[PDB]
Design a protein around this motif. Structure first.
Motif, PDB file in Angstrom:
ATOM      1  N   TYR A   1       0.843  -1.201   0.000  1.00 35.60           N
ATOM      2  CA  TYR A   1       0.000   0.000   0.000  1.00 35.60           C
ATOM      3  C   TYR A   1       0.881   1.255   0.000  1.00 35.60           C
ATOM      4  N   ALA A   2       1.912   1.243   0.850  1.00 35.45           N
ATOM      5  CA  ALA A   2       2.853   2.372   0.950  1.00 35.45           C
ATOM      6  C   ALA A   2       3.579   2.521  -0.352  1.00 35.45           C
ATOM      7  N   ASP A   3       4.095   1.398  -0.808  1.00 36.09           N
ATOM      8  CA  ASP A   3       4.775   1.342  -2.080  1.00 36.09           C
ATOM      9  C   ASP A   3       3.888   1.885  -3.212  1.00 36.09           C
ATOM     10  N   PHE A   4       2.594   1.648  -3.115  1.00 39.25           N
ATOM     11  CA  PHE A   4       1.686   2.133  -4.141  1.00 39.25           C
ATOM     12  C   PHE A   4       1.474   3.655  -4.059  1.00 39.25           C
ATOM     13  N   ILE A   5       1.199   4.215  -2.868  1.00 38.74           N
ATOM     14  CA  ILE A   5       0.937   5.680  -2.675  1.00 38.74           C
ATOM     15  C   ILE A   5       2.102   6.608  -3.031  1.00 38.74           C
ATOM     16  N   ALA A   6       3.298   6.058  -2.896  1.00 30.47           N
ATOM     17  CA  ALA A   6       4.499   6.792  -3.198  1.00 30.47           C
ATOM     18  C   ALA A   6       4.792   6.863  -4.681  1.00 30.47           C
ATOM     19  N   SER A   7       4.063   6.046  -5.466  1.00 27.18           N
ATOM     20  CA  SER A   7       4.257   5.908  -6.919  1.00 27.18           C
ATOM     21  C   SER A   7       3.649   6.941  -7.834  1.00 27.18           C
ATOM     22  N   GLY A   8       4.038   6.844  -9.105  1.00 27.23           N
ATOM     23  CA  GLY A   8       3.579   7.770 -10.125  1.00 27.23           C
ATOM     24  C   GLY A   8       2.199   7.486 -10.704  1.00 27.23           C
ATOM     25  N   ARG A   9       1.675   6.283 -10.530  1.00 25.23           N
ATOM     26  CA  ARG A   9       0.355   6.052 -11.104  1.00 25.23           C
ATOM     27  C   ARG A   9      -0.773   5.865 -10.081  1.00 25.23           C
ATOM     28  N   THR A  10      -0.977   6.864  -9.228  1.00 26.26           N
ATOM     29  CA  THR A  10      -2.049   6.759  -8.252  1.00 26.26           C
ATOM     30  C   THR A  10      -3.248   7.508  -8.764  1.00 26.26           C
ATOM     31  N   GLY A  11      -3.011   8.442  -9.671  1.00 27.60           N
ATOM     32  CA  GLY A  11      -4.130   9.189 -10.222  1.00 27.60           C
ATOM     33  C   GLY A  11      -4.822   8.460 -11.367  1.00 27.60           C
ATOM     34  N   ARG A  12      -5.667   9.198 -12.097  1.00 26.04           N
ATOM     35  CA  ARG A  12      -6.425   8.673 -13.233  1.00 26.04           C
ATOM     36  C   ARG A  12      -5.517   8.241 -14.360  1.00 26.04           C
TER      37      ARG A  12
END
Ligand SMILES: Cc1n[nH]c2ccc(-c3cncc(OC[C@@H](N)Cc4ccc(Br)cc4)c3)cc12
Lengths: 336, 20
Positions: B3-14
Protein backbone atom coordinates in the motif's frame (compact mmCIF):
# COMPACT_ATOMS: atom_id res chain seq x y z
CA UNK A 1 -30.71 -16.04 -19.56
CA UNK A 2 -30.02 -17.82 -22.95
CA UNK A 3 -33.60 -16.92 -23.78
CA UNK A 4 -33.03 -13.31 -22.61
CA UNK A 5 -29.84 -12.81 -24.52
CA UNK A 6 -31.60 -14.48 -27.42
CA UNK A 7 -34.24 -11.73 -27.57
CA UNK A 8 -31.43 -9.21 -26.93
CA UNK A 9 -29.34 -10.13 -29.97
CA UNK A 10 -32.25 -9.23 -32.22
CA UNK A 11 -32.71 -5.62 -31.06
CA UNK A 12 -28.97 -4.96 -31.21
CA UNK A 13 -28.77 -6.44 -34.74
CA UNK A 14 -31.56 -4.15 -35.97
CA UNK A 15 -29.80 -1.21 -34.43
CA UNK A 16 -26.39 -2.43 -35.65
CA UNK A 17 -27.64 -2.38 -39.25
CA UNK A 18 -29.49 0.91 -39.16
CA UNK A 19 -27.49 3.05 -36.74
CA UNK A 20 -29.11 6.41 -35.96
CA UNK A 21 -27.60 9.81 -36.84
CA UNK A 22 -27.80 13.53 -36.02
CA UNK A 23 -30.47 13.51 -33.36
CA UNK A 24 -29.77 17.14 -32.21
CA UNK A 25 -27.93 20.48 -32.49
CA UNK A 26 -25.41 22.05 -30.12
CA UNK A 27 -27.63 25.01 -29.37
CA UNK A 28 -30.36 22.92 -27.74
CA UNK A 29 -27.99 22.32 -24.82
CA UNK A 30 -26.54 24.59 -22.23
CA UNK A 31 -22.88 23.83 -21.53
CA UNK A 32 -22.30 23.72 -17.79
CA UNK A 33 -19.15 21.90 -16.67
CA UNK A 34 -16.33 19.54 -17.74
CA UNK A 35 -16.63 16.23 -15.88
CA UNK A 36 -13.70 14.48 -17.49
CA UNK A 37 -11.00 15.10 -19.98
CA UNK A 38 -9.03 13.10 -22.54
CA UNK A 39 -6.57 12.89 -25.42
CA UNK A 40 -9.00 14.44 -27.89
CA UNK A 41 -12.03 15.77 -26.05
CA UNK A 42 -13.84 16.45 -22.78
CA UNK A 43 -17.17 15.27 -21.37
CA UNK A 44 -19.43 18.11 -20.25
CA UNK A 45 -22.45 18.38 -17.91
CA UNK A 46 -24.91 19.89 -20.31
CA UNK A 47 -28.58 20.94 -19.98
CA UNK A 48 -31.24 20.30 -22.60
CA UNK A 49 -33.15 23.57 -22.75
CA UNK A 50 -36.34 22.10 -24.05
CA UNK A 51 -36.69 19.42 -21.44
CA UNK A 52 -34.68 20.93 -18.60
CA UNK A 53 -32.76 17.64 -18.38
CA UNK A 54 -29.02 17.04 -17.81
CA UNK A 55 -26.80 14.76 -19.81
CA UNK A 56 -23.07 14.24 -20.25
CA UNK A 57 -22.08 15.38 -23.75
CA UNK A 58 -18.84 13.92 -25.14
CA UNK A 59 -17.08 16.30 -27.50
CA UNK A 60 -14.51 14.75 -29.90
CA UNK A 61 -12.28 17.08 -31.88
CA UNK A 62 -12.29 15.70 -35.43
CA UNK A 63 -8.74 16.82 -36.32
CA UNK A 64 -7.26 15.35 -33.14
CA UNK A 65 -9.00 11.99 -33.64
CA UNK A 66 -7.43 11.92 -37.14
CA UNK A 67 -3.91 12.96 -35.89
CA UNK A 68 -4.18 10.18 -33.31
CA UNK A 69 -5.48 7.71 -35.90
CA UNK A 70 -8.61 6.91 -33.96
CA UNK A 71 -11.29 7.14 -36.67
CA UNK A 72 -12.38 3.48 -36.71
CA UNK A 73 -12.41 3.28 -32.93
CA UNK A 74 -14.48 6.45 -32.74
CA UNK A 75 -16.88 5.02 -35.30
CA UNK A 76 -17.16 1.73 -33.36
CA UNK A 77 -17.98 3.71 -30.26
CA UNK A 78 -21.01 5.57 -31.59
CA UNK A 79 -22.27 2.55 -33.55
CA UNK A 80 -22.05 0.08 -30.68
CA UNK A 81 -23.36 2.64 -28.17
CA UNK A 82 -26.54 3.48 -29.96
CA UNK A 83 -27.18 -0.24 -30.52
CA UNK A 84 -26.82 -1.75 -27.02
CA UNK A 85 -29.27 -1.68 -24.10
CA UNK A 86 -28.60 -3.06 -20.62
CA UNK A 87 -29.15 -1.80 -17.01
CA UNK A 88 -25.43 -1.28 -16.42
CA UNK A 89 -24.36 0.60 -19.56
CA UNK A 90 -24.83 4.33 -20.00
CA UNK A 91 -27.57 5.39 -22.42
CA UNK A 92 -26.60 7.33 -25.55
CA UNK A 93 -29.37 9.89 -25.93
CA UNK A 94 -28.20 11.82 -28.97
CA UNK A 95 -25.43 12.29 -31.44
CA UNK A 96 -24.71 14.99 -34.01
CA UNK A 97 -21.73 16.75 -35.45
CA UNK A 98 -20.64 20.05 -36.79
CA UNK A 99 -17.88 21.49 -38.88
CA UNK A 100 -15.55 20.92 -35.98
CA UNK A 101 -16.47 18.04 -33.69
CA UNK A 102 -18.46 14.94 -32.93
CA UNK A 103 -20.95 14.72 -30.05
CA UNK A 104 -22.51 12.00 -27.98
CA UNK A 105 -25.05 13.17 -25.43
CA UNK A 106 -25.29 10.44 -22.84
CA UNK A 107 -27.03 10.14 -19.53
CA UNK A 108 -25.58 12.12 -16.62
CA UNK A 109 -24.61 9.61 -13.92
CA UNK A 110 -24.57 11.65 -10.73
CA UNK A 111 -22.61 9.32 -8.37
CA UNK A 112 -19.11 10.08 -9.72
CA UNK A 113 -16.40 7.61 -10.71
CA UNK A 114 -15.73 4.37 -8.83
CA UNK A 115 -12.07 5.39 -9.00
CA UNK A 116 -12.72 8.49 -6.90
CA UNK A 117 -14.47 6.71 -4.05
CA UNK A 118 -12.01 3.82 -3.95
CA UNK A 119 -9.05 6.18 -3.90
CA UNK A 120 -10.55 8.20 -1.03
CA UNK A 121 -11.92 5.13 0.81
CA UNK A 122 -8.76 3.12 0.29
CA UNK A 123 -10.04 -0.42 -0.40
CA UNK A 124 -13.49 -2.11 -0.49
CA UNK A 125 -14.63 -5.03 1.62
CA UNK A 126 -15.10 -8.27 -0.32
CA UNK A 127 -18.87 -7.93 -0.06
CA UNK A 128 -18.78 -4.38 -1.44
CA UNK A 129 -16.43 -5.40 -4.25
CA UNK A 130 -18.56 -8.48 -5.07
CA UNK A 131 -21.63 -6.28 -5.43
CA UNK A 132 -19.80 -4.44 -8.20
CA UNK A 133 -18.17 -7.54 -9.77
CA UNK A 134 -21.51 -9.28 -10.31
CA UNK A 135 -22.62 -6.24 -12.25
CA UNK A 136 -19.60 -6.34 -14.60
CA UNK A 137 -20.04 -10.12 -14.86
CA UNK A 138 -23.50 -9.81 -16.31
CA UNK A 139 -22.51 -6.82 -18.41
CA UNK A 140 -19.70 -8.80 -20.05
CA UNK A 141 -22.00 -11.79 -20.48
CA UNK A 142 -24.34 -9.52 -22.45
CA UNK A 143 -21.58 -7.69 -24.32
CA UNK A 144 -19.74 -10.85 -25.40
CA UNK A 145 -23.02 -12.50 -26.52
CA UNK A 146 -23.19 -9.78 -29.15
CA UNK A 147 -19.65 -10.59 -30.33
CA UNK A 148 -18.42 -7.39 -28.67
CA UNK A 149 -15.17 -6.96 -26.71
CA UNK A 150 -15.16 -4.08 -24.17
CA UNK A 151 -11.39 -3.66 -23.77
CA UNK A 152 -11.11 -0.75 -21.22
CA UNK A 153 -12.21 -1.89 -17.79
CA UNK A 154 -10.81 0.29 -14.97
CA UNK A 155 -12.34 2.23 -12.02
CA UNK A 156 -12.14 5.44 -14.06
CA UNK A 157 -14.69 4.07 -16.55
CA UNK A 158 -17.26 2.81 -14.05
CA UNK A 159 -19.68 5.33 -12.60
CA UNK A 160 -22.04 4.98 -9.58
CA UNK A 161 -25.70 6.00 -10.03
CA UNK A 162 -28.31 7.26 -7.53
CA UNK A 163 -29.05 3.72 -6.43
CA UNK A 164 -25.39 2.76 -5.81
CA UNK A 165 -25.23 0.76 -9.06
CA UNK A 166 -22.60 0.68 -11.80
CA UNK A 167 -22.83 2.46 -15.20
CA UNK A 168 -20.08 1.48 -17.68
CA UNK A 169 -19.10 4.47 -19.87
CA UNK A 170 -16.40 4.87 -22.53
CA UNK A 171 -16.80 2.45 -25.42
CA UNK A 172 -13.89 4.04 -27.32
CA UNK A 173 -12.17 0.65 -27.75
CA UNK A 174 -15.33 -1.50 -27.91
CA UNK A 175 -15.32 -3.75 -30.94
CA UNK A 176 -17.70 -6.26 -32.52
CA UNK A 177 -15.33 -9.00 -33.55
CA UNK A 178 -15.82 -12.65 -34.37
CA UNK A 179 -12.34 -14.14 -34.27
CA UNK A 180 -8.99 -12.77 -33.06
CA UNK A 181 -8.09 -9.08 -33.09
CA UNK A 182 -4.75 -7.22 -32.81
CA UNK A 183 -4.77 -3.54 -31.66
CA UNK A 184 -2.63 -2.68 -28.62
CA UNK A 185 -5.45 -1.02 -26.68
CA UNK A 186 -6.44 -0.22 -23.11
CA UNK A 187 -4.73 0.96 -19.95
CA UNK A 188 -1.35 -0.58 -19.03
CA UNK A 189 -2.50 -1.87 -15.63
CA UNK A 190 -5.31 -3.80 -17.22
CA UNK A 191 -3.61 -5.37 -20.30
CA UNK A 192 -3.74 -9.20 -20.66
CA UNK A 193 -0.38 -10.74 -21.48
CA UNK A 194 -1.53 -11.81 -25.01
CA UNK A 195 -2.20 -8.19 -25.80
CA UNK A 196 1.17 -6.96 -24.65
CA UNK A 197 2.66 -10.02 -26.33
CA UNK A 198 1.26 -8.96 -29.72
CA UNK A 199 -0.39 -12.31 -30.25
CA UNK A 200 -3.94 -11.56 -31.37
CA UNK A 201 -6.75 -12.06 -28.89
CA UNK A 202 -10.42 -12.52 -28.13
CA UNK A 203 -12.88 -11.85 -25.27
CA UNK A 204 -10.62 -13.56 -22.79
CA UNK A 205 -8.94 -10.20 -22.23
CA UNK A 206 -12.17 -8.89 -20.69
CA UNK A 207 -12.10 -11.63 -18.04
CA UNK A 208 -8.41 -10.92 -17.16
CA UNK A 209 -9.28 -7.20 -16.89
CA UNK A 210 -12.16 -8.12 -14.51
CA UNK A 211 -9.64 -10.15 -12.51
CA UNK A 212 -7.58 -6.99 -12.16
CA UNK A 213 -10.61 -4.89 -11.21
CA UNK A 214 -11.69 -7.15 -8.37
CA UNK A 215 -8.08 -7.09 -7.12
CA UNK A 216 -7.78 -3.25 -7.16
CA UNK A 217 -11.15 -2.97 -5.40
CA UNK A 218 -10.59 -5.45 -2.55
CA UNK A 219 -6.91 -4.56 -1.88
CA UNK A 220 -6.85 -0.91 -2.87
CA UNK A 221 -4.11 -1.20 -5.51
CA UNK A 222 -3.41 -3.01 -8.88
CA UNK A 223 -1.80 -6.50 -8.89
CA UNK A 224 0.93 -5.10 -11.19
CA UNK A 225 2.19 -1.49 -10.84
CA UNK A 226 5.44 0.44 -11.37
CA UNK A 227 6.29 3.99 -12.44
CA UNK A 228 6.50 3.44 -16.13
CA UNK A 229 4.27 1.19 -18.27
CA UNK A 230 7.26 -0.86 -19.55
CA UNK A 231 7.85 -2.00 -15.96
CA UNK A 232 4.14 -2.93 -15.59
CA UNK A 233 4.02 -4.93 -18.89
CA UNK A 234 7.02 -6.82 -17.58
CA UNK A 235 5.12 -7.75 -14.44
CA UNK A 236 1.92 -8.69 -16.27
CA UNK A 237 3.71 -11.16 -18.58
CA UNK A 238 5.68 -12.69 -15.67
CA UNK A 239 2.64 -14.40 -14.28
CA UNK A 240 3.63 -13.88 -10.64
CA UNK A 241 1.03 -12.40 -8.31
CA UNK A 242 1.21 -11.73 -4.56
CA UNK A 243 -2.07 -11.58 -2.66
CA UNK A 244 -2.83 -9.27 0.31
CA UNK A 245 -3.05 -11.26 3.55
CA UNK A 246 -6.62 -10.10 4.03
CA UNK A 247 -7.87 -11.87 0.89
CA UNK A 248 -10.19 -14.75 1.56
CA UNK A 249 -9.15 -18.12 0.16
CA UNK A 250 -12.16 -18.12 -2.18
CA UNK A 251 -11.12 -14.71 -3.46
CA UNK A 252 -7.53 -15.78 -3.89
CA UNK A 253 -8.73 -18.72 -5.96
CA UNK A 254 -11.20 -16.75 -8.11
CA UNK A 255 -8.31 -14.41 -8.86
CA UNK A 256 -5.84 -17.20 -9.63
CA UNK A 257 -8.29 -18.41 -12.31
CA UNK A 258 -9.21 -15.00 -13.71
CA UNK A 259 -5.56 -13.89 -13.84
CA UNK A 260 -4.36 -16.96 -15.70
CA UNK A 261 -1.63 -16.34 -18.27
CA UNK A 262 -2.45 -19.70 -19.90
CA UNK A 263 -5.64 -18.68 -21.70
CA UNK A 264 -6.72 -22.24 -22.26
CA UNK A 265 -6.97 -22.41 -18.44
CA UNK A 266 -8.52 -18.96 -17.83
CA UNK A 267 -12.03 -18.67 -16.35
CA UNK A 268 -14.56 -17.14 -18.73
CA UNK A 269 -12.60 -18.61 -21.60
CA UNK A 270 -13.32 -22.26 -20.78
CA UNK A 271 -15.81 -24.84 -22.03
CA UNK A 272 -18.59 -23.85 -19.60
CA UNK A 273 -18.09 -20.16 -20.39
CA UNK A 274 -19.26 -17.45 -17.95
CA UNK A 275 -20.74 -20.07 -15.63
CA UNK A 276 -17.33 -20.99 -14.27
CA UNK A 277 -17.30 -17.52 -12.71
CA UNK A 278 -20.99 -17.24 -11.82
CA UNK A 279 -20.65 -20.58 -10.12
CA UNK A 280 -17.44 -19.83 -8.21
CA UNK A 281 -17.29 -20.18 -4.45
CA UNK A 282 -16.69 -16.44 -3.92
CA UNK A 283 -19.96 -15.70 -5.72
CA UNK A 284 -22.08 -18.32 -3.92
CA UNK A 285 -24.10 -15.63 -2.14
CA UNK A 286 -24.81 -13.53 -5.22
CA UNK A 287 -28.42 -13.51 -6.54
CA UNK A 288 -27.74 -12.70 -10.17
CA UNK A 289 -31.49 -12.27 -10.84
CA UNK A 290 -31.95 -9.85 -7.94
CA UNK A 291 -28.87 -7.97 -9.12
CA UNK A 292 -30.00 -7.67 -12.73
CA UNK A 293 -33.29 -6.30 -11.40
CA UNK A 294 -31.53 -3.76 -9.18
CA UNK A 295 -33.36 -5.24 -6.22
CA UNK A 296 -30.21 -5.83 -4.18
CA UNK A 297 -29.02 -3.93 -1.12
CA UNK A 298 -26.54 -1.40 -2.46
CA UNK A 299 -23.60 -1.25 0.00
CA UNK A 300 -22.85 2.41 -0.71
CA UNK A 301 -24.93 5.17 -2.19
CA UNK A 302 -23.15 8.33 -3.10
CA UNK A 303 -25.78 10.90 -2.27
CA UNK A 304 -25.95 14.09 -4.26
CA UNK A 305 -27.89 17.26 -3.61
CA UNK A 306 -30.12 17.74 -6.62
CA UNK A 307 -29.97 17.87 -10.45
CA UNK A 308 -26.83 19.33 -11.94
CA UNK A 309 -24.98 18.60 -8.74
CA UNK A 310 -21.42 17.79 -9.79
CA UNK A 311 -19.72 17.41 -6.40
CA UNK A 312 -18.64 13.83 -7.00
CA UNK A 313 -16.37 14.90 -9.88
CA UNK A 314 -12.97 16.61 -9.82
CA UNK A 315 -12.47 20.10 -11.24
CA UNK A 316 -11.05 20.61 -14.69
CA UNK A 317 -9.94 23.82 -16.45
CA UNK A 318 -12.56 24.99 -18.91
CA UNK A 319 -11.46 25.08 -22.50
CA UNK A 320 -13.88 26.96 -24.79
CA UNK A 321 -15.79 25.26 -27.63
CA UNK A 322 -14.54 26.42 -31.02
CA UNK A 323 -16.48 25.50 -34.17
CA UNK A 324 -14.88 26.29 -37.53
CA UNK A 325 -16.37 28.16 -40.48
CA UNK A 326 -15.00 25.24 -42.48
CA UNK A 327 -16.24 21.64 -42.18
CA UNK A 328 -13.15 19.74 -41.06
CA UNK A 329 -12.98 16.02 -41.74
CA UNK A 330 -16.11 15.36 -43.76
CA UNK A 331 -15.31 12.17 -45.55
CA UNK A 332 -13.56 10.50 -42.67
CA UNK A 333 -16.65 10.83 -40.44
CA UNK A 334 -19.59 10.75 -42.87
CA UNK A 335 -21.13 7.72 -41.26
CA UNK A 336 -21.27 9.47 -37.86
CA UNK B 1 3.95 -2.28 2.72
CA UNK B 2 2.58 -2.70 -0.81
CA UNK B 3 0.00 0.00 0.00
CA UNK B 4 2.85 2.37 0.95
CA UNK B 5 4.78 1.34 -2.08
CA UNK B 6 1.69 2.13 -4.14
CA UNK B 7 0.94 5.68 -2.68
CA UNK B 8 4.50 6.79 -3.20
CA UNK B 9 4.26 5.91 -6.92
CA UNK B 10 3.58 7.77 -10.12
CA UNK B 11 0.35 6.05 -11.10
CA UNK B 12 -2.05 6.76 -8.25
CA UNK B 13 -4.13 9.19 -10.22
CA UNK B 14 -6.42 8.67 -13.23
CA UNK B 15 -4.74 6.34 -15.68
CA UNK B 16 -4.77 7.25 -19.35
CA UNK B 17 -5.46 4.86 -22.23
CA UNK B 18 -2.68 3.76 -24.50
CA UNK B 19 -3.42 4.60 -28.15
CA UNK B 20 -0.36 4.59 -30.44
C1 LIG C 1 -19.46 11.98 -15.67
C2 LIG C 1 -20.42 11.26 -16.59
N1 LIG C 1 -21.75 11.26 -16.45
N2 LIG C 1 -22.33 10.54 -17.42
C3 LIG C 1 -21.41 10.00 -18.29
C4 LIG C 1 -21.45 9.23 -19.41
C5 LIG C 1 -20.26 8.87 -20.05
C6 LIG C 1 -19.02 9.30 -19.57
C7 LIG C 1 -17.75 8.92 -20.28
C8 LIG C 1 -17.73 8.76 -21.66
N3 LIG C 1 -16.62 8.42 -22.34
C9 LIG C 1 -15.48 8.23 -21.67
C10 LIG C 1 -15.40 8.38 -20.29
O1 LIG C 1 -14.14 8.17 -19.72
C11 LIG C 1 -13.91 8.79 -18.47
C12 LIG C 1 -12.41 8.70 -18.14
N4 LIG C 1 -11.82 7.48 -18.69
C13 LIG C 1 -11.60 9.96 -18.52
C14 LIG C 1 -11.93 10.51 -19.89
C15 LIG C 1 -12.44 11.79 -20.03
C16 LIG C 1 -12.79 12.29 -21.28
C17 LIG C 1 -12.61 11.50 -22.40
BR1 LIG C 1 -13.10 12.16 -24.09
C18 LIG C 1 -12.08 10.23 -22.29
C19 LIG C 1 -11.73 9.74 -21.03
C20 LIG C 1 -16.56 8.73 -19.60
C21 LIG C 1 -19.00 10.09 -18.43
C22 LIG C 1 -20.15 10.46 -17.78
Amino acid sequence: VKEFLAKAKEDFLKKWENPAQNTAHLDQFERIKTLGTGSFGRVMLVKHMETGNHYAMKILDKQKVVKLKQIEHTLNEKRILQAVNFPFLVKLEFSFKDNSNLYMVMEYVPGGEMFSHLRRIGRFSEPHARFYAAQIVLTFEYLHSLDLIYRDLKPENLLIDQQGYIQVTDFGFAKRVKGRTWTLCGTPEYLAPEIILSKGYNKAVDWWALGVLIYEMAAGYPPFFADQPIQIYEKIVSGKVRFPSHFSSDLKDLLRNLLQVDLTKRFGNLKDGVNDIKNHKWFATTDWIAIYQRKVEAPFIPKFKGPGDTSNFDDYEEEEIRVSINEKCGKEFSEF
Amino acid sequence: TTYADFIASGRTGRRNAIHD
